[PDB]
Amino acid sequence: GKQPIAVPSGVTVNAQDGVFKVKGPKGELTVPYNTELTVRQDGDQLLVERPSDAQKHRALHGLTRTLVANAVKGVSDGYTINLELRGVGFRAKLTGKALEMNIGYSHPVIIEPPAGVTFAVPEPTRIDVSGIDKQLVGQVAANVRKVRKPDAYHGKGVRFVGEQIALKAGK
Amino acid sequence: KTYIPKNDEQNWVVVDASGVPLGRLATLIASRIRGKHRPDFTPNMIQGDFVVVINAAQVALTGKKLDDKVYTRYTGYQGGLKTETAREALSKHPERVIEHAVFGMLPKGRQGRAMHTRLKVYAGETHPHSAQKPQVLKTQPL
Amino acid sequence: MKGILGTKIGMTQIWKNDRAIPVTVVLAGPCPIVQRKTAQTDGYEAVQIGYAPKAERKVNKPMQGHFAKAGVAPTRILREFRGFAPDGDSVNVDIFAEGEKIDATGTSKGKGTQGVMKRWNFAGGPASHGSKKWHRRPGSIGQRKTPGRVYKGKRMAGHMGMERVTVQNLEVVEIRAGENLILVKGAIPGANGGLVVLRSAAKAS
Amino acid sequence: WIQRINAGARLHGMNYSTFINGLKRANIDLNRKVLADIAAREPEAFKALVDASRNARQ
RNA sequence: ACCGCUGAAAGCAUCUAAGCGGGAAGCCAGCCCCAAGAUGAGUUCUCCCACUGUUUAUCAGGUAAGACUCCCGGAAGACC
RNA sequence: GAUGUCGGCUCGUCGCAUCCUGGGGCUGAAGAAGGUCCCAAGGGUUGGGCUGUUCGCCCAUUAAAGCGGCACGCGAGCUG
RNA sequence: GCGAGAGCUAACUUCCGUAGCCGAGAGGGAAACAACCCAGACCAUCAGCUAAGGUCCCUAAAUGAUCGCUCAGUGGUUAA
Ligand SMILES: [Mg+2]
Numbered sequence: 168g169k170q171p172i173a174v175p176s177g178v179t180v181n182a183q184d185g186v187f188k189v190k191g192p193k194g195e196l197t198v199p200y201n202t203e204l205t206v207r208q209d210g211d212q213l214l215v216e217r218p219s220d221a222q223k224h225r226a227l228h229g230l231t232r233t234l235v236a237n238a239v240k241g242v243s244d245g246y247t248i249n250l251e252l253r254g255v256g257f258r259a260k261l262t263g264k265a266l267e268m269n270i271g272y273s274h275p276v277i278i279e280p281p282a283g284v285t286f287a288v289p290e291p292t293r294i295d296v297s298g299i300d301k302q303l304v305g306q307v308a309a310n311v312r313k314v315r316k317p318d319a320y321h322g323k324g325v326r327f328v329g330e331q332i333a334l335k336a337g338k
Numbered sequence: 339k340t341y342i343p344k345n346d347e348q349n350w351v352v353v354d355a356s357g358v359p360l361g362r363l364a365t366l367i368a369s370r371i372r373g374k375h376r377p378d379f380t381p382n383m384i385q386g387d388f389v390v391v392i393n394a395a396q397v398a399l400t401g402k403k404l405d406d407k408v409y410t411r412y413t414g415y416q417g418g419l420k421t422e423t424a425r426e427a428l429s430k431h432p433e434r435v436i437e438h439a440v441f442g443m444l445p446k447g448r449q450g451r452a453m454h455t456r457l458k459v460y461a462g463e464t465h466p467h468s469a470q471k472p473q474v475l476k477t478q479p480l
Numbered sequence: 481m482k483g484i485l486g487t488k489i490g491m492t493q494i495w496k497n498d499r500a501i502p503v504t505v506v507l508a509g510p511c512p513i514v515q516r517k518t519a520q521t522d523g524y525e526a527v528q529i530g531y532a533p534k535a536e537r538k539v540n541k542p543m544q545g546h547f548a549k550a551g552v553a554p555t556r557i558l559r560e561f562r563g564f565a566p567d568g569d570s571v572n573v574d575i576f577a578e579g580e581k582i583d584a585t586g587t588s589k590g591k592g593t594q595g596v597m598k599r600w601n602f603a604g605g606p607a608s609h610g611s612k613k614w615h616r617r618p619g620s621i622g623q624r625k626t627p628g629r630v631y632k633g634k635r636m637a638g639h640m641g642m643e644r645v646t647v648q649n650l651e652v653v654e655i656r657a658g659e660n661l662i663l664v665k666g667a668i669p670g671a672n673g674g675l676v677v678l679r680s681a682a683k684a685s
Numbered sequence: 686w687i688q689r690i691n692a693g694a695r696l697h698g699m700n701y702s703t704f705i706n707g708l709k710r711a712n713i714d715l716n717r718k719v720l721a722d723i724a725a726r727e728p729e730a731f732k733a734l735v736d737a738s739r740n741a742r743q
Numbered sequence: 744a745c746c747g748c749u750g751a752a753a754g755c756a757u758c759u760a761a762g763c764g765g766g767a768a769g770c771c772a773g774c775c776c777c778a779a780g781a782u783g784a785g786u787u788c789u790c791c792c793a794c795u796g797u798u799u800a801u802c803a804g805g806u807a808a809g810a811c812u813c814c815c816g817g818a819a820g821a822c823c
Numbered sequence: 824g825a826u827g828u829c830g831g832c833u834c835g836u837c838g839c840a841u842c843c844u845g846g847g848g849c850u851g852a853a854g855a856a857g858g859u860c861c862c863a864a865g866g867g868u869u870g871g872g873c874u875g876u877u878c879g880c881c882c883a884u885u886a887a888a889g890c891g892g893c894a895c896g897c898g899a900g901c902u903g
Numbered sequence: 904g905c906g907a908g909a910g911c912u913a914a915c916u917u918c919c920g921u922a923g924c925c926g927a928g929a930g931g932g933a934a935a936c937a938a939c940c941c942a943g944a945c946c947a948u949c950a951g952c953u954a955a956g957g958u959c960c961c962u963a964a965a966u967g968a969u970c971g972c973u974c975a976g977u978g979g980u981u982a983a
Pocket residue numbers: 590591592819
């Protein structure tokens with residue numbers, strides 16, 4: 168189970184209604200939150216309690232908390248995912264903002280970053296997906312990776328840096 | 339002997355269907371239409387009131403129904419029996435859901451058919467019958 | 481959008497570069513504006529124009545009033561084209577360039593009440609294998625006690641033709657402009673001295 | 686007769702069953718044909734019979 | 744079908760139990776044709792007008808705009 | 824005091840326990856080509872030789888040459 | 904329906920036994936429905952209470968009251 172909420176000193180999670188909204192320094196947000204359980208600040212910290220305790224109540228508990236959590240750690244720290252391209256010469260860049268994936272496909276695949284998120288390159292065989300949301304960035308890197316899931320033979324594809332991949336091996 | 343009346347009046351109302359289960363508003367309106375709330379009630383006369391429904395767009399249907407609720411319109415033609423989700427028909431043409439409901443709840447003979455006409459079906463909060471001065475009916479069980 | 485009206489004049493053989501293209505000649509003598517319908521006026525987005533001219537005498541009163549509402553002189557024929565606009569009055573120059581694919585609509589040549597063959601391409605019957613009085617007849621209409629009916633729309637003898645037919649992606653070989661003559665690749669349905677409407681293609685490719 | 690009475694009752698706040706029951710309770714032994722008649726041709730009378738039935742009910 | 748994002752119950756893990764993305768020759772829409780007898784009968788432009796007849800005759804008559812009738816024909820069609 | 828039967832021919836249209844085509848999981852799946860299972864019924868499913876034959880065997884092709892229901896569909900439709 | 908036999912603890916199956924029902928039984932109920940649940944129609948009535956069975960609208964009668972369950976449209980057809 169879970170309760171403790173650690174807010175920094177430049178937050179403002181205006182806990183009105185059920186639409187418990189935030190406006191952190193790393194760009195403000197708007198976050199859709201459960202009404203029938205209620206949550207607010209109690210000084211320097213903050214808390215999300217729950218009414219009844221059958222079982223279905225016990226979900227939107229740890230759910231909603233970890234969600235507002237995601238908001239906090241997002242408007243403060245921000246978010247980021249490291250991606251790497253492995254395989255016979257795979258490469259990506261930047262069309263202003265669009266992701267220039269060149270992944271051993273007869274005709275190139277380029278992607279367009281929705282709002283809130285932004286793209287990033289270091290050495291071209293790596294992509295850094297960063298933005299204010301933590302859902303959305305997940306919901307984007309998901310796609311980028313899903314341009315070519317690392318195959319089960321050489322492990323050639325797109326992956327989360329450290330990520331181990333197991334390798335069947337063939338003939 | 340018993341008192342057979344004479345159909346003056348022609349009385350009008352506004353059912354706001356915003357946020358009400360279908361079946362319920364369905365019988366409320368079906369009843370106001372049939373006439374049954376008229377103590378001078380009469381079975382071969384269509385005494386009933388005129389019903390103006392607003393916001394048939396914003397009716398309440400209890401989940402998951404609008405992703406389960408089929409509507410089957412057979413066409414004479416093989417491969418006719420076409421379908422439609424409740425949300426489909428709702429975004430398409432919502433007054434044809436409300437119409438469809440109220441119409442199962444009214445007699446299927448010469449009368450009932452004719453009664454259908456006493457239904458005026460809309461969406462949002464707008465009707466062109468401001469000339470008929472409809473009395474804003476409510477939502478209760480009385 | 482793109483559209484105009486004219487007559488089916490004839491099928492003929494002509495050459496571009498080296499090949500026998502077969503071309504049907506349409507005419508699209510100037511069409512005049514007559515009615516310009518917009519949403520706030522008539523709900524939907526269109527324009528009514530007109531083809532073959534007509535002398536004031538053989539003309540109705542109402543139709544006269546109409547044609548006079550925008551000083552036009554009567555056309556024996558009216559028609560609408562959805563989502564147009566122009567400015568002035570409407571010929572084929574400014575409307576087609578040579579080579580542009582186009583959708584050409586006419587009425588067919590109709591054939592009267594027609595056989596199961598001619599109409600719908602039925603099989604037939606063994607013209608000599610004992611086959612009493614069954615040479616041209618479509619055989620069976622159904623099954624049996626189930627369903628016990630005959631299907632809706634079951635093809636069978638019927639008036640064939642005089643349908644409204646559209647043929648798709650046709651190519652403007654040639655524009656004899658200001659002779660309002662149009663050359664078009666291939667077929668176009670419905671008889672010579674025909675009434676046809678050349679509209680832009682429906683599609684893209 | 687029945688549906689007309691049901692109507693009547695409901696026209697104020699009563700059920701048919703409750704009206705008719707409080708009109709069994711105060712022993713007001715009226716035929717229901719008559720009750721229809723009262724109900725649809727005679728307003729304030731139906732009113733009173735109502736107030737009665739309800740009184741005797743509680 | 745399936746693939747995933749955020750993610751609690753079950754401090755971990757989880758595509759799911761709240762929500763969200765992707766996903767077929769299939770469904771709906773898009774394409775061609777019919778279509779207001781859609782009796783819920785729609786919309787638009789234009790035209791003729793406000794005629795006459797003791798209701799001893801509370802509805803007819805003569806007409807306008809327009810149309811048929813009839814002749815002559817047709818790449819329309821058995822007749823229509 | 825009559826519900827005419829096999830097979831062909833004509834005509835069709837439904838079921839999905841899917842032959843092809845489309846999508847996916849597994850693979851003893853390197854690739855190519857496959858096995859097998861989940862979703863999927865829009866369209867498609869060749870021409871002959873022998874036999875009344877359905878069926879089945881063979882010729883030659885094919886993306887495929889699917890299985891069944893419609894009184895073992897269909898004689899006031901023909902064969903016979 | 905309960906008893907057993909032949910059957911395959913198949914049949915709107917058949918051959919006994921046993922109760923009721925239809926046959927020779929209308930009336931209400933079970934949507935519809937000889938057999939089932941209520942019930943045995945001497946005529947008349949624009950009169951009242953009940954049975955089985957019901958009481959959101961079609962369709963008479965509580966969208967009743969309080970303690971609960973299931974969220975699967977289960978209800979509204981089966982099993983290891
Ligand atoms: Mg002809």
